[PDB]
């Protein structure tokens, strides 16, 4: 017997993703995490979207 | 009326009745809504932001 995920994971656009989808026709998932790392000066994210 | 000398003729007009008919002139103006507008107004997906 193996343990398997019981449900589909959920991917949600953040409101910044709404703004950039409308304006630039593009999305950067985890926009705020890129933002916070970039201003903090840190080069590595813990994981991807 | 002005009462006048007995020899001068005159008239007996006390009132006259005059009828005015209303003149009709309707106005109109269109406004247009797209099928996409009606879809997003009416069929509110629960969906996302």
């Amino acid at each position: 017997t193996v343990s398997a995920p019981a449900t589909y994971g959920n991917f949600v656009l953040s409101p910044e993703n709404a703004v950039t989808a409308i304006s630039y026709h593009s999305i950067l998932a985890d926009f705020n995490s890129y933002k916070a790392h970039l201003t903090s000066g840190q080069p590595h994210l813990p994981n991807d979207s | 009326r002005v009462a006048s000398g007995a020899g001068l003729p005159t008239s007996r007009q006390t009132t006259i009745m005059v009828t005015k008919y209303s003149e009709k002139s309707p106005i109109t103006i269109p406004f247009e809504l797209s099928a996409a507008c009606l879809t997003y107004l009416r069929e509110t997906f629960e969906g996302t932001i």
Side-chain angles (χ1 to χ4, degrees):
Chain A
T1 75
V2 317
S3 308
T7 185
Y8 306 109
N10 216 61
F11 176 92
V12 295
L13 293 185
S14 76
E16 302 77 25
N17 296 335
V19 184
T20 68
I22 287 162
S23 313
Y24 309 124
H25 302 287
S26 186
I27 292 303
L28 178 66
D30 300 7
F31 177 99
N32 297 300
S33 84
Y34 279 87
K35 177 174 81 103
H37 285 74
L38 192 67
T39 59
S40 304
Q42 290 143 358
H44 290 126
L45 291 169
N47 61 342
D48 67 296
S49 77
Chain B
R1 295 184 294 157
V2 179
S4 63
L8 189 76
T10 194
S11 184
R12 291 156 178 87
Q13 297 278 5
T14 59
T15 57
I16 72 168
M17 176 254 257
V18 49
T19 57
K20 294 289 188 78
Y21 293 90
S22 67
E23 293 197 328
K24 303 148 205 77
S25 59
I27 59 172
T28 184
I29 193 87
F31 71 97
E32 297 167 47
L33 298 177
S34 56
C37 159
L38 288 165
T39 293
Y40 287 115
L41 167 87
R42 183 171 52 78
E43 306 191 339
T44 296
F45 309 84
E46 62 282 57
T48 64
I49 80 180

